[PDB]
Amino acid sequence: AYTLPQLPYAYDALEPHIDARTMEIHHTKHHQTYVDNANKALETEFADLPVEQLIQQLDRVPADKKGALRNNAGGHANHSMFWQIMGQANQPSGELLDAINSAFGSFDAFKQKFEDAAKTRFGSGWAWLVVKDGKLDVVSTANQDNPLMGEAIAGVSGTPILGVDVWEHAYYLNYQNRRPDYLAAFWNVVNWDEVSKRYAAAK
Numbered sequence: 001a002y003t004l005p006q007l008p009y010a011y012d013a014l015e016p017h018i019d020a021r022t023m024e025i026h027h028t029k030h031h032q033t034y035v036d037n038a039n040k041a042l043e044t045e046f047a048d049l050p051v052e053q054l055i056q057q058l059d060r061v062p063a064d065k066k067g068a069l070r071n072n073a074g075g076h077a078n079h080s081m082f083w084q085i086m087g088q089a090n091q092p093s094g095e096l097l098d099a100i101n102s103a104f105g106s107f108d109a110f111k112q113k114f115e116d117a118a119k120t121r122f123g124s125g126w127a128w129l130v131v132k133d134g135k136l137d138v139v140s141t142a143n144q145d146n147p148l149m150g151e152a153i154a155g156v157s158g159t160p161i162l163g164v165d166v167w168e169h170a171y172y173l174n175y176q177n178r179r180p181d182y183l184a185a186f187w188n189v190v191n192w193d194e195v196s197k198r199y200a201a202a203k
């Protein structure tokens, strides 16, 4: 059903912002296990949907496969997006920048807001820039929850166009407890061409 997608770049392509050993473990170990356990939970009538569509249909799948698919289909969708919105000062332009200035006042203030949501995510989770009713918004989720899941499951909603992984596995080898330093580094590896593309597709 699902497979591990290939990275668009080498494991060391994001140095020194994210370390190569982390990129390799994160991808070949953590994401792989999300795929494995998602596939095992789908082996069911929902195994033909792409992961992005499945996680919109969780309140629908059996009551007892729901936790495993949420966590694991969630983890697959999230990490799959995550590799694609990174790439080797760095900022958006065009319509996405205009919408950022409209929703948050400025690129610099959007960053602050995105960082703050990432920092106050207590425990494991993600921070997201989403499109909701045509407008940009910053939110976060717990664990492998995704805003595509809806308000009831995820506690928030919208279509993610960018996300940052703040599970500790995402930054502990390079930054230990220093999440904020990880978050500042993350800005240097965002691929805003890809994010601009996702914004066009979702507005």
Ligand SMILES: [Mn+2]
Residues within 6 Å of the ligand: 026, 030, 079, 165, 167, 169, 170
């Ligand atoms: Mn992760």
